[PDB]
Amino acid sequence: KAARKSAPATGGVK
Amino acid sequence: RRLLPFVSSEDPAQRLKQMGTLASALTELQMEFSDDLTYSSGMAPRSANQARFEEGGMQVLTKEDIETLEQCRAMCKRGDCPPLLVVFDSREGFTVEADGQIKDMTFIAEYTGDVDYIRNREHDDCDSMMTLLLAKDPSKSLVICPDKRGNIARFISGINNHTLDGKKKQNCKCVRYSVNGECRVFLVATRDIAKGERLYYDYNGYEHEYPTQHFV
Ligand SMILES: Nc1ncnc2c1ncn2[C@@H]1O[C@H](CSCC[C@H](N)C(=O)O)[C@@H](O)[C@H]1O
C-alpha cells in the first residue's frame, strides 16, 4: 500500500 | 539563512570507521552505495526530473548554496564524509547518529536512490521511498527508491507525528530544491547536534503518506 516520505518544495529550511 | 558545509572527523581512522558502518548497513540490505540520483531502465528517465513540473513551483537553490553543496559532494569523494554513524537499534532498526558536532544549518546529505514514477510504485513495499516531484498530472510524479542503490540518508529516522512530545526529537529537516532545473532532496540540521545524538526529521513534511503512530 505504499508508504512515502515527503518534504516541502517551498519555505526554505528555517 | 545560508547552508553550512559539514566538518568531517579529524582523525582519519574515525572517518574510515564511520564509512564502515554505512558499508556494513548497505551490505545488510544488499545495496550498492550511490551518492547520486540514478535513472535506471523501466523506471523514470532523467528527462522526467524537471522542477518546473512541481505543482506550485519549487524553491531554487542559490548559487551560494550550490557552491556549498558542490564542496560537500567533493569532500565525500575524497573520503571526508559527514561525521555520522549508522547504528542498529532494536526498536528502530538502522539509525544514524552524529559522531561529531553538527551545527545548525549544516548540510547532512542528499537523499539518493533510483528515481521512478510514483505510478510505478503504488504497490511497492520499500520502507524508504521519498517524494521527488509532485506534478499536477500524477502520472508524472516521481519518487526516490533507495532499495537497490542509495546512501546514508535512507537510514535516518523519523519522528512520531502522533504523540504530544514526538516533535521534540526533530533536529533536522528534509527539503526539496531546484538545482539546474531538476528536483533534488536534501537534509539539513535545524539545530546544533551533539556527538552521539540520533538524527530525526519529519517523514511527513508535505504529504502525510508515511505511517508513524508506532514510532519511538
Ligand atoms: N522513530 C522511529 N521509531 C521506530 N522505528 C522507526 C522510527 N523512525 C524510523 N523507523 C523505522 O525505519 C523505517 C524507515 S527507513 C529508516 C531506516 C530503517 N530503520 C532501517 O533499518 O533500514 C520505518 O518504517 C521504521 O521501521
The residue type of B115 is V
Q: Which of B22, B30, B89, B92 to mutate to test the pocket of ligand 1 (most atoms within 8 A of CB)?
A: B92
Residue B155 Cβ < 6 Å to ligand 1: yes
Task: Give A 1-14 residues with CB within 8 A of chain B.
Answer: 1-14
Q: How far apart are CA B168 and CA B188, in angstroms?
A: 16
**Could you give the 3-state DSSP secondary structure of residue B173?**
strand
Residues on chain B touching A1 (C-beta within 8 angstroms)? 123
Residues on chain B touching A4 (C-beta within 8 angstroms)? 118, 129-131, 143, 207, 209-210
Residues with Cβ within 8 Å of residue B188, at least 6 apart in sequence: A13, B3, B105, B106, B107, B108, B172, B173, B175
Q: Pick the residue of B68, B182, B209 with the most A CBs within 10 A to test the interface with A by mutation.
A: B209
User: What is the grid cell recorded at B6?
Assistant: 559539514
**Could you give the 3-state DSSP secondary structure of residue A8?**
coil
Q: How far apart are CA B106 and CA B65, in angstroms?
A: 11
One of 3.90.550.10, 2.170.270.10, 3.40.190.80, 3.10.270.10 is the CATH number of B1-216, namely 2.170.270.10
**Closest alpha carbon to B172 in B193, B159, B188:** B188
Contact assessment for residue B105 and residue B2, using Cβ atoms and an 8 Å cutoff: yes
Is B151 buried (19+), middle (13-18) or exposed (0-12) by CB count in 10 A?
Answer: buried
Q: How far apart are CA B61 and CA B64, in angstroms?
A: 8
Contact assessment for residue B195 and residue B98, using Cβ atoms and an 8 Å cutoff: yes
Task: Give B 121-180 residues with CB within 8 A of chain A.
Answer: 121-124, 127-131, 134, 143, 158, 173-177
Contact assessment for residue B205 and residue B173, using Cβ atoms and an 8 Å cutoff: yes
State residue B35 phi and psi, 5-degree precision.
Answer: -95, 20
Residues with Cβ within 8 Å of residue B43, at least 6 apart in sequence: B114, B115, B116, B117, B120, B145
Q: How far apart are CA B60 and CA B16, in angstroms?
A: 34
Q: How far apart are CA B188 and CA B173, in angstroms?
A: 5
Determined by which method?
X-ray
Q: How far apart are CA B75 and CA B168, in angstroms?
A: 31
CA dihedral B175, B33, B16, B27 (to 10 degrees): 120
